[PDB]
Design a protein around this ligand. Structure first.
Ligand SMILES: O=c1ccn([C@@H]2O[C@H](COP(=O)(O)OP(=O)(O)O[C@H]3O[C@H](CO)[C@@H](O)[C@H](O)[C@H]3O)[C@@H](O)[C@H]2O)c(=O)[nH]1
Ligand SMILES: O=c1ccn([C@@H]2O[C@H](COP(=O)(O)OP(=O)(O)O[C@H]3O[C@H](CO)[C@@H](O)[C@H](O)[C@H]3O)[C@@H](O)[C@H]2O)c(=O)[nH]1
Ligand SMILES: O=P(O)(O)OC[C@H](O)CO
Ligand SMILES: O=P(O)(O)OC[C@H](O)CO
Ligand SMILES: [Mn+2]
Ligand SMILES: [Mn+2]
Lengths: 277, 277
């Protein structure tokens, strides 16, 4: 593949990777909205790395109203609200907002994102993801893949239509990935569920494929959302993808008939966090 | 809805509808590719209308290699191959080809399409669909709806993005619909699975919503295809939708990793069947 792809279990040990840091730091961010059932398992999969390979782990709590925050705290995680991450700026809804704000609440040269709704995640996710950033050259972004309705019906076919160079990316919508701060604070952040696809297209347009790697995380399980919520997610993915391709989006939310309901869509990106410096 | 929508069971009787024909004829087309398990049930749901409300029923056999044709014949249906429908023109693959060719093998002023993979279809499908064409004014196209992964994730959200006026169409991808010959032979036909969405957008752009109605057919069951085949279907739907919206499509087929496989996509429409006159 024209895309650096690690097809089998990476061979790097935790101690090698740590040596390879060479003064660089690593932050881990778990965005979370109402994931009380899974958040503790995810934090626990990663907290053993802290003060070693990982210099920092935070939960970016994105407005949870369940026990996400208390359970995360009881697992020893630093929990940061959207408001605390960036208090001069009023909070908008959606995942992209949470991730963008997380840049202001972390200081790692490398930032790793892991969804907090994962079912029994491997403790090597973070080592496997930072590998190419640490030991490669010019890699600034690493995507995960795994053995994807929105992914297989919406994002990959749309990429084939409009950015076929990215056809080799197996899981463009993957919530597990790592990237340099220099890259992330230089890119705008799409709102809502548009954030991954925006980052991928923006990264590629700006640095080309050679700046991107992907690593196999094996098998993945997570919360299965209802079709209607996916419809809304897909709508936002489309809105962001069309925008990156110079195509005007109507700005009209998807409507569904159960009576009538209109879901929000946003055509507004957050600017590169750099301007907030 | 700005779209003429019949929300409950239509009240027209078969005898009223027949009276309303007023010299107009009605053709029914069942496109079929390897539907031996369901084809007989579908034909039988409709053949009682023949020589009455329905003047003509054909199965457009689209290259079947199972018992579709023999079973359809044994149910008393006229079976027409792609080659027989239009023998001067070599056959291309896909559904859109079959439907376009079916225009050459029928002569009804009204043409009704019904998928041949339906599980126990109602015998009133055809009466319910021709209703607005017979008793309305200016209606040239009638779509069905029902209580849709490609539909809900790809087509409706893309329509919301690019032709939001069509947001009120509940089942844009529905295989059950009827339209005037005058309309159908005036429109190009998208290849493969692009044919429905192309017809809807072309119809709207040319006649506006007032020329379109939709009728509730209740509940629908059909063959559930694997995700990868849907991926390919979605790719073609996207290709056709982008084209109708003036957006250049790469022409690159969707690739999937199981090793690598590329599915065909086509950017070539068939012209209005009128030019073949
Ligand atoms: O407003 C939100 C919505 C989600 N999340 C968190 O983000 C993660 C992913 O959200 P989820 O609802 O599980 O998304 P998915 O349906 O799995 O969507 C997939 O595809 C999306 C589009 O790229 C990605 O954003 C997701 O990370 C990816 O898992 C979860 O941990 C959530 O807790 C927030 O923090 N705030
Ligand atoms: O090359 C082909 C492919 C399909 N068919 C027939 O067309 C009908 C619909 O095909 P199907 O594979 O069942 O499509 P769906 O997955 O159900 O796709 C839905 O969405 C598509 C995109 O609009 C429509 O074309 C379909 O009619 C609609 O049911 C079936 O009776 C097939 O026998 C052909 O005749 N030739
Ligand atoms: O929830 P699924 O089964 O529709 O697939 C979700 C993938 O992990 C992300 O698109
Ligand atoms: O086969 P489904 O369940 O994915 O839905 C199919 C609809 O009838 C057409 O998009
Ligand atoms: Mn999830
Ligand atoms: Mn079907």
């Amino acid at each position: 593949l024209p895309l650096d792809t690690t097809w089998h279990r990476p061979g790097w040990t935790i101690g090698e990777l740590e040596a390879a840091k060479a003064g660089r730091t690593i932050s881990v961010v778990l965005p979370a909205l109402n994931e009380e059932a899974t958040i503790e398992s995810v934090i626990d999969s990663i907290s053993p790395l802290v003060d070693g390979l990982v210099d920092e782990l935070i939960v970016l709590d994105s407005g949870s109203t369940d026990d996400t925050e208390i359970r995360a705290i009881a697992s020893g995680a630093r929990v940061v609200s959207r408001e605390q991450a960036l208090p001069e700026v009023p909070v908008r809804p959606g995942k992209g907002e949470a991730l963008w704000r997380s840049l202001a609440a972390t200081s790692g040269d490398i930032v790793v994102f892991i969804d907090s709704d994962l079912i029994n995640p491997h403790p090597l996710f973070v080592p496997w993801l930072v590998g190419p950033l640490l030991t490669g050259e010019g890699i600034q972004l690493v995507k995960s893949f795994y053995r994807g309705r929105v992914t297989e019906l919406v994002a990959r076919p749309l990429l084939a239509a409009l950015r076929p160079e990215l056809g080799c990316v197996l899981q463009p919508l993957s919530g597990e990935y790592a990237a340099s701060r220099e890259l992330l604070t230089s890119l705008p952040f799409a709102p809502g569920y548009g954030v991954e696809i925006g980052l991928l297209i923006d990264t590629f347009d700006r640095l080309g494929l050679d700046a991107i790697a992907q690593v196999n995380l094996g098998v993945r399980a997570h919360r299965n959302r209802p079709l209607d919520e996916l419809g809304a997610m897909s709508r936002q993915v489309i809105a962001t993808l069309l925008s990156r391709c110079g195509i005007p989006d109507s700005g009209v939310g998807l409507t569904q008939f159960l009576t009538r309901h209109t879901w929000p869509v946003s055509l507004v990106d957050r600017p590169p966090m750099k301007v907030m410096r």
